[PDB]
Amino acid sequence: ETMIPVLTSKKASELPVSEVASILQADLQNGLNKCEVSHRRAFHGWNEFDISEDEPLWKKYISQFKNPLIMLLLASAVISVLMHQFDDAVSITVAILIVVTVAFVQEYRSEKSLEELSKLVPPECHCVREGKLEHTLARDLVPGDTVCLSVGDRVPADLRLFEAVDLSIDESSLTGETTPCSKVTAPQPAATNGDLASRSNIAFMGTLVRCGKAKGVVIGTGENSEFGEVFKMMQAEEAPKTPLQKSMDLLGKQLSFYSFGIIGIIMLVGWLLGKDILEMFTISVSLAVAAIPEGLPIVVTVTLALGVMRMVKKRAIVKKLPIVETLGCCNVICSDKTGTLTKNEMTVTHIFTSDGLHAEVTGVGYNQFGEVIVDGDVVHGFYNPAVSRIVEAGCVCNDAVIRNNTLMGKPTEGALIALAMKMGLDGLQQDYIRKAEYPFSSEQKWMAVKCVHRTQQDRPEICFMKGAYEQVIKYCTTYQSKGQTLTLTQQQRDVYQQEKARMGSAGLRVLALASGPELGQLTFLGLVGIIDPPRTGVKEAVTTLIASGVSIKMITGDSQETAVAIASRLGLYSKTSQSVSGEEIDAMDVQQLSQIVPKVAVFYRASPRHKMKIIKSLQKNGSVVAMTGDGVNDAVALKAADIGVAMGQTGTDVCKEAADMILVDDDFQTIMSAIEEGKGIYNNIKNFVRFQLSTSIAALTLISLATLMNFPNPLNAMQILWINIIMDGPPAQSLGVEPVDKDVIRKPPRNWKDSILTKNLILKILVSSIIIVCGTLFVFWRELRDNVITPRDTTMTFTCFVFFDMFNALSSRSQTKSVFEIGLCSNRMFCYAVLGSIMGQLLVIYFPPLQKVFQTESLSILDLLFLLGLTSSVCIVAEIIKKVERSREKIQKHVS
Ligand SMILES: [Ca+2]
């Protein structure tokens, strides 16, 4: 039924708007209906670049026959096959299959996580359907739809522009031209077409709209696009690696080189004396496999993805991989007023009446949560006549209303309706009938209305007056004093002026109120203090950030008094803290301000140019900044600077596409969560590195001590492989995945020039390795008195090493906190992995097939109990060492 063809960009440009609309059967005003949209979905499909088919599971299963350590293991297996030892060959083959299976599961999990770490930020756009503007994903778009383009929005697909008002889009990512090209709606000549270089009529996908508003009819989605192929071939590229990943890779390479050298030296030493060449060779190969970091980058990727997704569970979205590691190193965290530290709503805080009483108003927002307190007493309704007359004049003589906690109109007035409604006087506005109105003007700086009571129309007309103090006081001749009307004198006017000055010096926006029968004979009522209030948890968050050592810098555009009052009421201001004006920032720029920027916290009457200036100065001495901002002017401030914390609620697509991580709640409380998640990721990486190093060093020391004087070794190739999978499998992932502890927020910020392997961690590694080696050697010498026991010594030493590794994993959960504080059962999956490892060890020890495979002899209850009692000699030592360390730290802090 007249299938809609896909119009290419050149063709859609060459015919006029009407012909293109007729071809696409597109309604320019009402848009497309849902049924036709679904039909075009069924025919065309998803508006998204065709995916590249991924290799099946057996491709990856075969691909793990690379890294030829397994190749020499299979060579040893087939050599044993040719040497007529079927049992050992089949055992090593079964161990090989188990190793490749576990590596396959680990690789599948890592690749699935990496692939799933691509849907955090979907494309967004606006479309018009059935005559209504709908907010829908760009993946929904089908040709023929009408999409509205605004300032800062990202173009979702190719469109044919029919209406445009001073359009300005950036094609630098598509054409390389730094100069935006103005767009028109008239059709372009066909002869003027090579590359774009002129195409001001057709909108291209992926470009960024800089200025202007327009509407267009989409001509093509997905694969069908002229530069859609260019964008597709630009995509599917390898993302850059974070410096932490490079450091981890370097550490792994160094560890692998040292392990290979040690293994070669040990093998040569063993071959120097009389031993078995094949058994020692395969044992050395298994040890080289064990002591090589193959799960370190994998677990780093999984823990980074888990932290990013945990932040996503919170009210924050993180895009870039190498941005997360810089969250914990931030020390110059910055913020701004009107949205970050203070909700973008006005709230009245202080009320001063004509009789001089001071009233404090609690609560924030245009809601009923809050109270008005006068001299320690809560005032509701008309209990206090002085405040009641003020709120009556405010509510009756007002034009703004509040619906579902949403305000339209003047924010200063809306704060006044909120204040009046807080005590239950929302319906007082409907109780009066307005007769005459005087609208607010910038010249007069005041407004008033004349009204009478709805049910008491016989009463004389009452005029309610408000505005700036200098204008209100001119029409006021009398004032109320404890229920008595007295003439306004000069002394009371001076008192009023000094009260206004005091309020202004404290950040209060001064608004006056009055009431009377007619203009010029009005009776004054009092003053109201309007101030942008801080959010719920901004004060506590700022205090916690400052206590750790993270300096907070505040930049705003209001007056000095309001900014300094906000800083003082939050904690940013201190005894020694200056403030720099925007004009001073403009006059002198880079050289002599960096010597004063570490001791400043307030920037008022600033600008995006001043934002760039302070960013450059703060980056000159060397620090990590957290500059925020939304819109178009705050794009470079998030590009050239450090982590660009942006807002996904009131922000534009520029700060959500061409910038760093974004917030969906527009609050300051979502930064400490990201910092804690990053520090927890770092702690998990440190714990995994410590455990892996400790177990590898212990195993290598045990094997070297067995080899040195031709001592009969207790672990064969299969047992070494099982220890390796224990140290680099489900238990390794369980150690690497751990919930964050609520103590890293007090830690000082991490420096960029830091190292994972600290002195304390290294000392603990050697302590644990020495304890494990000593315990295993003691068990081996205890069992080896009769000098002839082939199966039981190996079985018991292997199970003792397994128990020691499990206890070391239990102890290495935290570095500064004992396992008792976090609880025995904190990570459910860690406990599941521990139970699975215990079950596997029991199956290996008891199952006759596993007994034949691993050369295992069944133990008894008494031996198992003795081994469990002996294997605890490391966990308790680590726990008491940590307890002593934290007690000493607490004592030193207390006596400081
Ligand atoms: Ca390994």
Numbering used by the authors: 15 to 910
In the authors' words:
Secretory-pathway Ca2+-ATPases (SPCAs) play critical roles in maintaining Ca2+ homeostasis, but the exact mechanism of SPCAs-mediated Ca2+ transport remains unclear. Here, we determined six cryo-electron microscopy (cryo-EM) structures of human SPCA1 (hSPCA1) in a series of intermediate states, revealing a near-complete conformational cycle. The overall structure of hSPCA1 is typical of a P-type ATPase, with ten transmembrane (TM) helices (TM1–TM10) and three conserved cytosolic domains: the actuator (A), phosphorylation (P), and nucleotide-binding (N) domains.
To gain insight into how hSPCA1 recognizes Ca2+, we successfully obtained the structures of hSPCA1 bound to Ca2+ in three different states: CaE1, CaE1-ATP, and CaE1P-ADP. In hSPCA1, the N domain interacted with the P domain through several residues, including Gly518, Ser519, Ala520, Gly521, Ile545, Glu575, Thr576, Ala579, and Ile580, with a distance between the 480KGA motif and the 350DKT motif at ~25.0 Å. As expected, there was no interaction observed between the A and N domains. No significant conformational changes were observed in the TMD and the A and P domains during the transition of CaE1 → CaE1-ATP, with the root mean square deviation (RMSD) being 0.83 Å. MD simulations of the CaE1 state showed a solvent-accessible cavity facing the cytosol formed by TM1, TM2, and TM4. This cavity provided access to the Ca2+-binding site, suggesting a possible entry pathway for Ca2+. During the Ca2+ transport cycle, hSPCA1 starts with a loosely arranged headpiece of cytosolic domains, with the N domain ready to bind ATP. Ca2+ from the cytosol can then enter the binding site through the cytosol-facing cavity.
